[PDB]
C-alpha positions as a printed NumPy array, in Angstrom:
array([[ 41.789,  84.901,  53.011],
       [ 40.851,  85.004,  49.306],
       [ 41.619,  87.666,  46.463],
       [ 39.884,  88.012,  43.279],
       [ 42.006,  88.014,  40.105],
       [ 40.277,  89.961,  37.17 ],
       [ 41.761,  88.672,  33.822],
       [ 41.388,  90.682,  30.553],
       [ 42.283,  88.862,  27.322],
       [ 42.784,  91.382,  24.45 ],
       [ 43.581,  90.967,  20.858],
       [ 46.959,  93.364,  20.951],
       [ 47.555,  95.217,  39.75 ],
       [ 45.157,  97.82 ,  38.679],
       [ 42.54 ,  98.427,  36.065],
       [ 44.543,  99.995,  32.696],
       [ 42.035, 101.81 ,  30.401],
       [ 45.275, 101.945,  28.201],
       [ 43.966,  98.856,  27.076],
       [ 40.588, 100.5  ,  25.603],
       [ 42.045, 100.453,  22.086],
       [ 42.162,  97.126,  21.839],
       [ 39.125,  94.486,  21.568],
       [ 38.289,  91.901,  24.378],
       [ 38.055,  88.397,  23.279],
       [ 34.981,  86.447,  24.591],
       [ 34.821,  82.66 ,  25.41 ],
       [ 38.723,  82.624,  25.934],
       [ 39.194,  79.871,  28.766],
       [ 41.833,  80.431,  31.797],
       [ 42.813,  77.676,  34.052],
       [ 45.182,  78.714,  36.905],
       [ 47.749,  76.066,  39.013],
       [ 48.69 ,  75.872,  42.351],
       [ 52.143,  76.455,  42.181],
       [ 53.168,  77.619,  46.022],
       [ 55.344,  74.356,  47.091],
       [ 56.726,  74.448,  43.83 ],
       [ 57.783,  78.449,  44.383],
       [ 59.295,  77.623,  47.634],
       [ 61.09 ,  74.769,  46.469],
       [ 62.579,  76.651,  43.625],
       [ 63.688,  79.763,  46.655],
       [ 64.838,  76.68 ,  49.082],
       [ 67.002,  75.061,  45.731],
       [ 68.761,  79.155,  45.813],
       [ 66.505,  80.911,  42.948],
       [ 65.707,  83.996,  43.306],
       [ 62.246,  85.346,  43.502],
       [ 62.084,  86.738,  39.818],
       [ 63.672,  83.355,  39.105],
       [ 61.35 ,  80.596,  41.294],
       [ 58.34 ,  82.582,  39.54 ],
       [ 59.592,  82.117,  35.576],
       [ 60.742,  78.628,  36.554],
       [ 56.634,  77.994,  37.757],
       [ 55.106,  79.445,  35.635],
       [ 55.706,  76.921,  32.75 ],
       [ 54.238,  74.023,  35.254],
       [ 50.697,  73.77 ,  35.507],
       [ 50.486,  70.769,  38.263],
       [ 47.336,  68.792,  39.293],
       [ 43.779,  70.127,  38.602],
       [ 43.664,  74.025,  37.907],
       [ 42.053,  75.558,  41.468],
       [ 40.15 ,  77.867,  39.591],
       [ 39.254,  78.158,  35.915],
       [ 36.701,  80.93 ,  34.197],
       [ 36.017,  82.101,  30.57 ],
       [ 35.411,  85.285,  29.373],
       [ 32.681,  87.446,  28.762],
       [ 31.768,  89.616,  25.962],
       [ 34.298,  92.322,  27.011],
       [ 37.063,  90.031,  27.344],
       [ 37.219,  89.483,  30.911],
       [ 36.775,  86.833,  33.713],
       [ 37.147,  86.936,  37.723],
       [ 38.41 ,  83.808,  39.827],
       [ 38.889,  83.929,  43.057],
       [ 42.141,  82.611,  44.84 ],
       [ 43.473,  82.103,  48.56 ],
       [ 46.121,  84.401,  49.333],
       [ 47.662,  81.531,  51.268],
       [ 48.308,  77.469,  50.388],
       [ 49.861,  74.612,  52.521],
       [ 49.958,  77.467,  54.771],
       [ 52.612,  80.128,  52.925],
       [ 51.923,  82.853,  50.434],
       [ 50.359,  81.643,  47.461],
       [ 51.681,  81.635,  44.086],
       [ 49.713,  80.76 ,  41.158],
       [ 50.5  ,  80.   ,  37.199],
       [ 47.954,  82.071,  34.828],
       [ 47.474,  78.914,  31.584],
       [ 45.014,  80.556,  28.304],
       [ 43.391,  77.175,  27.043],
       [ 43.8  ,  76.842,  23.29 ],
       [ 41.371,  78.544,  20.881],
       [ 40.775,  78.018,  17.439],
       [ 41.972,  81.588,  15.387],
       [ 43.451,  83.024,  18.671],
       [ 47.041,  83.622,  19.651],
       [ 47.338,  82.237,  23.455],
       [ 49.345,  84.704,  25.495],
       [ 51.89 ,  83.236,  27.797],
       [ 51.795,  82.035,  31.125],
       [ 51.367,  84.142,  33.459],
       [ 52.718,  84.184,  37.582],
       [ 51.008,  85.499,  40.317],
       [ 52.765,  85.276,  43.857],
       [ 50.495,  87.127,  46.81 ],
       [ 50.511,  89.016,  48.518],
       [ 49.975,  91.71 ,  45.826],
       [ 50.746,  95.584,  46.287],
       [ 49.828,  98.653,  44.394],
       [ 52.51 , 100.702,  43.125],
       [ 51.531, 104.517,  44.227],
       [ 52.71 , 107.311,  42.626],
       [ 54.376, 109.461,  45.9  ],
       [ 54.357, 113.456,  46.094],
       [ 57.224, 113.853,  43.698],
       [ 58.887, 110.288,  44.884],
       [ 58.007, 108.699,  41.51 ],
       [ 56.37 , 105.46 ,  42.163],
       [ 56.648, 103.431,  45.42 ],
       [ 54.83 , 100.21 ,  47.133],
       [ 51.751, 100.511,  49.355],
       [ 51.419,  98.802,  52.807],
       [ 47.848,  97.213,  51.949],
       [ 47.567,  94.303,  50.221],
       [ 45.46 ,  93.928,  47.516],
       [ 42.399,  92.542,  47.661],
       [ 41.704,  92.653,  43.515],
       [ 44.045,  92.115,  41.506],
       [ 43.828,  93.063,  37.449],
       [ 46.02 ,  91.094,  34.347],
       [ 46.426,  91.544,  31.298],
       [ 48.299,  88.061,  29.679],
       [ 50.003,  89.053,  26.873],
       [ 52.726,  87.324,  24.682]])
């Protein structure tokens, strides 16, 4: 019913210890929109799905359905339903402002979420299970 989106904000789906080298930045606030009806509206109007999600994800509508700041290693959980008004969920990612920090960009996330696995030499491919966690990395 729910996932759990991890958020790491760094000073530069799955956990990417790539991202070691750079620091985490603590008490960095995330507030994240329902933007499903919006989504659907934007595929019902003809957009694409690429398209629906960068039209949402400069809209941040009502009261943020989740919201969490991060901890001294840069990172912060929330927890979202994988469905809203009954569809697949789609969410916009806002960084609150911060004094002496650069605020990445919005960032979408439509569910359900899939792991891309890398296949016995079949480069990399989609999995059939849904993710249950899902890692980000906002970025500019």
């Amino acid at each position: 019913e729910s996932a759990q989106l991890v958020i790491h904000k760094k000073k530069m789906g799955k956990e990417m210890s790539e991202f070691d080298k750079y620091q985490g930045l603590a008490d960095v606030t995330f507030s994240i929109y329902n933007v499903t009806s919006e989504f659907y509206e934007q595929r019902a109007a003809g957009a694409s799905v690429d398209a629906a999600k960068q039209a949402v994800q400069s809209l941040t509508p009502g009261k943020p359905v989740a919201q969490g700041t991060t901890d001294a290693n840069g990172n912060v959980t929330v927890q979202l339903p994988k469905k809203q008004n009954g569809k697949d969920a789609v969410y916009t990612i806002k960084e609150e402002p911060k004094e002496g920090v650069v605020a990445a960009t919005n960032m979408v996330v439509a569910f359900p979420v899939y792991e891309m696995i890398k296949q016995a030499d079949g480069s990399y491919k989609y999995g059939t299970e849904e993710l249950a966690v899902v890692h980000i990395y906002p970025k500019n």
